[PDB]
Design a protein around this ligand. Structure first.
Ligand SMILES: CCCCC[C@H]1O[C@@H]1[C@@H](O)/C=C\CCCCCCCC(=O)O
Ligand SMILES: [Fe+3]
Length: 836
């Protein structure tokens, strides 16, 4: 016979729970010693009566192992020997039963085997609730990755079974301890019961507002509307998708939620009352935000200061003062943001450097229906370009690819009259930029469009303004770019960020868990990039993009914010999400086998793109090596039932509204899976970081990144034009986001732009030893080494003086694509997943 030695590693709840960590021998671990936790080995080679592997005797935990050279923080180890013997096969999985009442996080199990076999490792990382709540014991598998063959015959039934356990079908209200993954439409952002004005359109499951599906939660429907789901202070997400933290400071989502319930009202009581002026009177009043900070009543400062997480982040001067960290944008020069140079630069290296396009014709047209501003150009004339520069015809300019455009016209046009009827006054902008010979981009003309002169047909009511270095013409031009940036800020926030990243990824996380076994090779490749994504998205539906959320209250599109992104989703295509595909689609690059990445870039000094191509290639190379390690032929792929079931569900369900698009890759080729996995991973890591981490550094100054517009362009000589003359600064302040909203926006994007101390970066980072496949382990080490190589390569670039665009007049070297970072508001770092 024999006795297999086992080592169990877990963490107690009050080591990861936010309530406990509020503050962050004694042996509480003695509670785990009686008959509190039992494990039961399952044979991987010895099949019982029919197929199903053979279970071992139920063994309870006996003994604390006070120390291991490899232990860790907040972790607890226990010894437990299992009775085994030659003939009982090799352990391949096991069942765990928690009788403790209080749940615990099981990290792992190691086995000092018996027959000619080395230690067997199990990486668990799961919350084990009381055994009373499941009816089917929580199962865990060994370190080995296996194709859907489910390989070990005796294990095959245990594999599909757990799969069935994860889907759970679509009925009932999900509870906190469950691990069920399923889809549902966006129908919980609104509050129809609290007013017909609070009802919001259901996004998805219809032609008009298509949308990716979100994680199903089954609360009862709304009274006033059955098609709507009841609101709750607790959105459910399969347990485990919600990651805990050892420190009271890394619970960023908590900080965001508490900023939307506690910080908001209390903050308005200071305005609604009078303890603070309602509007900024000068740029100087805005700069004081990072020096002295908003003097706030003592009463308030006592509450919005001690609460968990909101520490440090909320710089306080003891009392009253509510200082803000100075954004990197005004650290060196608090005036460079006004540069046309910096305005255009941020289009290539800013918070949203993904939109710019290369003009193919002139004047730029529209994608709108039968109205005439779509049936026929914009009002930017050929005798409006180049006010002193080179001196090339518009054709010659286009011919040598020197003209670029930032088109913010179509998405907001259809909703303009509606939006202009509120306290918000906006335009549907377009701006043309010329590529100077010095390598810089310069704004040549901005076109401010309004809707319907009369009626709606031929609703092309536009006014084009041109750069002006002098007098009131510069004040008018500085307001002109502000109307564009307000458009951009909003598109970025709702589409570039929320939609192209957060929303689009959720269906993949659901589809993956529902059909790929934890033991499946592809599951293990993708999993790290899904970390905490469903959790942050749940907070979003709760306090960000909801009925009266922060986004509806802080951005230009207002209450129509999300519907519009769903209208934008109309044009989303998975395969164009791959960076090289994106670049070409926009005319920013052309296919060229000669070049270091198969493509030739227009504007070589395009930070986001030059850096991103490196990381894109790094990711893609890594996935390819990993994939071809497991799939022998293309047929091996067409035979994978779990993968095939997974892709079909993603297409037909998760993104069900596009299930009929002809650009969906067929999982018939190994090359198509590499591509699909590369894009997903690219989206979850580098894309989100590139779009999410430069929010405060650039936008932490409302002047540089305004969120909403409250005034139309002052006219000819009216008293609005006369004040622009006498006081331009005040004319600017009255046109952009008011003081109260500026305070909200800064509070939120300062958290959003942070790195938690326990962030797992793309930088070859995982949790423990995910696999026993040595070959994969090595490929993963190569990936990591190439990343470190890349980081140095990019830092050198930031030193190259011939690449002004990486720094601009603001002297802000582009570091958003550097793989590593230390923690906090670092203008750098690429997390494995969308974690905030
Ligand atoms: C605990 C933190 C959770 C974060 C939740 C985030 O997902 C939400 C996000 O996608 C949705 C909208 C963010 C909009 C910000 C865009 C501002 C950019 C404008 C500029 O400054 O120039
Ligand atoms: Fe984000």
């Amino acid at each position: 016979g024999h006795k297999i030695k086992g080592t169990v590693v877990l963490m107690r709840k009050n080591v990861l729970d936010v309530n406990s960590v509020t503050s962050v021998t004694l042996d509480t671990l003695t509670a785990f010693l009686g008959r509190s936790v039992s494990l039961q080995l399952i044979s991987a080679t010895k099949a019982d009566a029919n197929g199903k592997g053979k279970l071992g005797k139920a063994t309870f935990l006996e003994g604390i192992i006070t120390s291991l050279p490899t232990l860790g923080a907040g972790q607890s180890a226990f010894k437990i020997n299992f009775e085994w013997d030659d003939g009982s096969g090799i352990p391949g999985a096991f069942y765990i039963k928690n009788f403790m009442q209080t749940e615990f996080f099981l990290v792992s199990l190691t086995l000092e085997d018996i027959p000619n076999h080395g230690s067997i490792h199990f990486v668990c990382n799961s919350w084990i609730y009381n055994a009373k709540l499941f009816k089917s014991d929580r199962i865990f598998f060994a370190n080995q990755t296996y194709l859907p063959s489910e390989t070990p015959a005796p294990l095959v039934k245990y594999r599909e079974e757990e799969l069935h356990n994860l889907r759970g079908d679509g009925t009932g209200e999900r509870k906190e301890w469950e691990r069920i993954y399923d889809y549902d439409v966006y129908n919980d952002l609104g509050d129809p019961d609290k007013g017909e004005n609070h009802a919001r359109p259901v996004l998805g499951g219809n032609d008009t507002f298509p949308y990716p599906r979100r994680g199903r939660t089954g609360r009862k429907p709304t009274r006033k509307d059955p098609n709507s789901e009841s609101r709750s202070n607790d959105v459910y997400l399969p347990r485990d998708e919600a990651f805990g933290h050892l420190k009271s400071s890394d619970f960023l989502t908590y900080g965001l939620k508490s900023v939307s319930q506690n910080v908001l009202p209390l903050l308005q009581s200071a305005f609604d009352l009078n303890f603070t002026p309602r509007e900024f009177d000068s740029f100087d009043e805005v700069h004081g935000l990072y020096s002295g900070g908003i003097k706030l009543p003592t009463d308030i400062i006592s509450k919005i200061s001690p609460l968990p997480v909101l520490k440090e982040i909320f710089r306080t001067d003891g009392e009253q003062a509510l200082k803000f960290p100075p954004p990197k944008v005004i650290q060196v020069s608090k005036s460079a943001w006004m540069t046309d140079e910096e305005f255009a630069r941020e289009m290539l290296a800013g918070v949203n450097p993904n939109l710019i396009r290369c003009l193919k014709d002139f004047p730029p047209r529209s994608k709108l229906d039968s109205q005439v501003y779509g049936d026929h150009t914009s009002q930017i004339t050929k005798e409006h370009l180049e006010p002193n520069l080179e001196g090339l015809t518009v054709d010659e300019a286009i011919q040598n690819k020197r003209l670029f455009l930032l088109d913010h016209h179509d998405p907001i046009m259809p909703y303009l009259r509606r939006i202009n009827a509120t306290s918000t006054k906006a335009y549907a902008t377009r701006t043309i930029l010329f590529l100077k010979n010095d390598g810089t981009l310069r704004p040549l003309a901005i076109e401010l469009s309004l809707p319907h002169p009369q009626g709606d047909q031929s609703g092309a009511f536009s006014q084009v303004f041109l750069p002006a270095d002098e007098g009131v013409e510069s004040s008018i031009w500085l307001l002109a770019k502000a109307y564009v940036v307000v458009n951009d800020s909003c598109y970025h926030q709702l589409v570039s960020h929320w939609l192209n990243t957060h929303a689009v990824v959720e269906p993949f996380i659901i589809a993956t868990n529902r059909h790929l076994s934890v033991v499946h090779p592809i599951y293990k490749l993708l999993h790290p990039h899904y970390r905490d994504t469903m959790n942050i998205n749940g907070l979003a539906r709760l306090s960000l993009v909801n009925d009266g959320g922060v986004i509806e209250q802080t951005f230009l599109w207002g209450r129509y914010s999300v519907e519009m992104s769903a209208v934008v989703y109309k044009d989303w295509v998975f395969t164009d999400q791959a960076l090289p595909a994106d670049l070409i689609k926009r005319g920013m690059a052309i296919e060229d086998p000669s070049c270091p990445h198969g493509i030739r870039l227009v504007i070589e000094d395009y930070p986001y793109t030059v850096d991103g191509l490196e990381i894109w290639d790094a990711i893609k190379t890594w996935v390819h090596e990993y994939v071809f390690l497991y799939y022998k032929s293309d047929d091996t792929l067409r035979e994978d039932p779990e993968l095939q079931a997974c892709w079909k569900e993603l297409v037909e369900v998760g993104h069900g509204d596009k299930k009929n698009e002809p650009w969906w890759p067929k999982m018939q080729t190994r090359e198509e899976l590499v591509e699909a996995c590369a894009i997903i991973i690219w989206t979850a890591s580098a894309l989100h970081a590139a779009v999410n981490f430069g929010q405060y550094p650039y936008g932490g100054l409302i002047l540089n990144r305004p969120t909403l517009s409250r005034r139309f362009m002052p006219e000819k000589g009216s008293a609005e034009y006369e004040e622009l003359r006498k006081n331009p600064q005040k004319a600017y302040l009255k046109t952009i986001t008011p003081k109260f909203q500026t305070l909200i926006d800064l509070s939120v994007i300062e958290i959003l732009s942070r790195h938690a101390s326990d962030e797992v970066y793309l930088g070859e980072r995982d949790n423990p030893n995910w696999t026993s496949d040595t070959r994969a382990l090595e490929a993963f080490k190569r990936f990591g080494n190439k990343l470190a190589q890349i980081e140095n390569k990019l830092s050198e670039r930031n030193n190259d003086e011939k690449l002004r665009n990486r720094c601009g007049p603001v002297q802000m070297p582009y570091t958003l694509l550097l793989p590593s970072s230390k923690e906090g508001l670092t203008f750098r770092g690429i997390p494995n997943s969308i974690s905030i």
